[PDB]
């Protein structure tokens, strides 16, 4: 549930933004279309809208008076991310 408003809104924004990466690739010969690169350009913003919002929670995980089981899990994926 990790956090009530932001992280659950950050997490469902992750699964929405890669869901249009399904519907972009699913065209016939995707990466050679002008609409294949035109729909893409919005998604290259929204993917780093999600890693940078994941970056914003990690500063609340280091500057820490919130929750230990929140912090142990989200850093476990984060050294599995940044390493």
């Amino acid at each position: 549930f990790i956090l009530l408003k932001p992280v659950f809104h950050c997490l469902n924004e992750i699964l929405e933004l890669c869901h249009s990466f399904c519907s972009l690739v699913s065209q016939n010969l995707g990466p050679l279309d002008e609409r294949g690169a035109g729909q893409l350009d919005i998604l290259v913003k929204g993917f780093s809208c999600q890693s940078s919002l994941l970056f914003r929670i990690l500063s609340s995980v280091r500057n820490h008076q919130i929750n230990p089981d929140l912090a142990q899990l989200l850093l476990r994926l984060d050294y599995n991310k940044y390493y």
């Binding site: 476990r76 050294y79 599995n80 991310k81 940044y82 390493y83």
Partner: protein, 436 residues
């Protein structure tokens, strides 16, 4: 559902798949001719993922075995595990082949038995309406497994385009070149088909087999009867998430998707430590999971002949560490805690890396529910040392005028030798370029 058809082919590919099916009955609690134990459904929660689904609780193997040599199949029917195999799915009694030892033999025999080779192996395809893919359990050594195996990598690419292809192919031996001399020719012709006409491979070196076969196994005369023991366990080890009930990467398109960086970079390093039976007397004292993955990244269990001083400029990108059976999962995150402190895997400087660990319960059996098992599926960029070894043995042979007049009489009119040389160097250059 998730049905895979194994394509056992060649002189060595048929024997490594014969004990692969023989390994599966001892862990499913079943007999090849009957069902005498009730441990098959209460202990094992899924059995119809490599076998054909049952008609009389007789789990038929979804296997086909073609070879030019009849010697490998005549050592099968006298064994009591051949009644599980069917004499109508592949061949009836007295099946034969060529004479025969050539790469151009099986490459030319594919289009003269083209009607029969695409008739009975397609009957098992429409048994399940959602086919997983095809694994070519073939060989690179000799001209039998390398000649005919290059043909099916082309015609099954377009007739079945939406299916996973990935092979457990064994590499030949490069110790001396007296009995066989055609080894640099038939290997590189299949190795081109393994990168562009095939998605992934699982490499299995032969010079690294006797490194392990004299390490802990203590033999004096190396025979062919030991080549099936290291190979059949890691085959069943690779499907423990797929056969036994797992959750994540429980399909064959689950495991291979999380390890391949790019096409033509798919050569996965394999490791497997526990092969000794006298370890059993000291695993009663709770031998933990904290010590079993410290030796996987340590180059001791590897089955790939690579350089020891070439790992400083090469970087791991994807490493798999599969624990099986008793795991004690309250310390499996504790084992992954100690990975970042050593940095035994060199990490790519351009992007992130990943150490993926997974578990699944083993068979209800006493040597399986007691001893910890570790299966490694690495991906390190020092694999070009084998490609530098094969290419240096390839261009040196063409300057000695070896098999240029003895090889182009049948079905070869143009020089396709540099077609294999540049595409091999394309693999070797894009590997070193991949870490920017």
């Amino acid at each position: 559902p998730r049905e895979i058809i194994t394509l056992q082919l060649g002189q060595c590919g048929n024997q490594i798949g014969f004990e692969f099916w023989k390994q599966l009955c001892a862990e499913h609690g079943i007999s090849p001719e009957g069902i005498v134990e009730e441990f098959a459904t209460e202990g094992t929660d899924r059995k119809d993922v490599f076998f054909y689904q049952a008609d009389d609780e007789h789990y038929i193997p979804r296997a086909v075995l073609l070879d030019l040599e009849p010697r490998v199949i005549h050592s099968i029917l006298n064994s009591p595990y051949a009644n599980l195999y069917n004499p109508e799915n592949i061949y009836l009694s007295e099946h034969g082949g060529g004479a025969g030892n050539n790469w151009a033999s099986g490459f030319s025999q594919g289009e003269k038995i083209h009607e029969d080779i695409f008739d009975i192996i397609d009957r098992e395809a429409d048994g399940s309406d959602s086919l997983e893919g095809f694994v070519l359990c073939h060989s690179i050594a000799g001209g039998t497994g390398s000649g005919l195996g290059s043909y099916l990598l082309e015609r099954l690419n377009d007739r079945y385009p939406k299916k996973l292809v990935q092979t457990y192919s064994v590499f030949p031996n490069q110790d001396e070149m007296s009995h066989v001399v055609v080894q640099p020719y038939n290997s590189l012709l299949t190795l081109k088909r393994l990168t562009q006409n095939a998605d992934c491979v699982v490499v299995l070196d032969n010079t690294a087999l006797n490194r392990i076969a004299t390490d802990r196994l203590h033999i004096q005369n190396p025979s062919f009867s030991q080549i099936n023991q290291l190979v059949s366990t890691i085959m069943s080890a690779s499907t423990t998430t797929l056969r036994y009930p797992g959750y994540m990467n429980n399909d064959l398109i689950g495991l291979i998707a999380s390890l391949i960086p790019t096409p033509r970079l798919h050569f996965l390093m394999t490791g497997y430590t526990p092969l000794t039976t006298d370890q059993s007397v000291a695993s009663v004292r709770k031998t933990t999971v904290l010590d079993v993955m410290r030796r996987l990244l340590q180059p001791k269990n590897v089955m790939v002949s690579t350089g020891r001083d070439r790992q400083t400029n090469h970087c791991y990108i994807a490493i798999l560490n599969i624990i099986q059976g008793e795991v004690d999962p309250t310390q499996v995150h504790k084992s992954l805690q100690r990975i970042r402190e050593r940095k035994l895997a060199n990490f790519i400087p351009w992007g992130p890396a990943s150490i993926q660990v997974a578990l699944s319960r083993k068979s209800p059996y006493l040597p399986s529910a007691h001893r910890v098992s570790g299966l490694m599926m690495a991906n390190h960029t020092n694999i070009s040392s084998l490609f530098e070894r094969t290419c240096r043995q390839y261009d040196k042979l063409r300057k000695r005028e070896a098999f240029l007049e003895q090889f182009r009489k049948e079905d070869i009119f143009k020089d396709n030798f540099d077609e294999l040389d540049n595409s091999r160097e394309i693999v070797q250059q894009l590997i070193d370029e991949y870490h920017a």
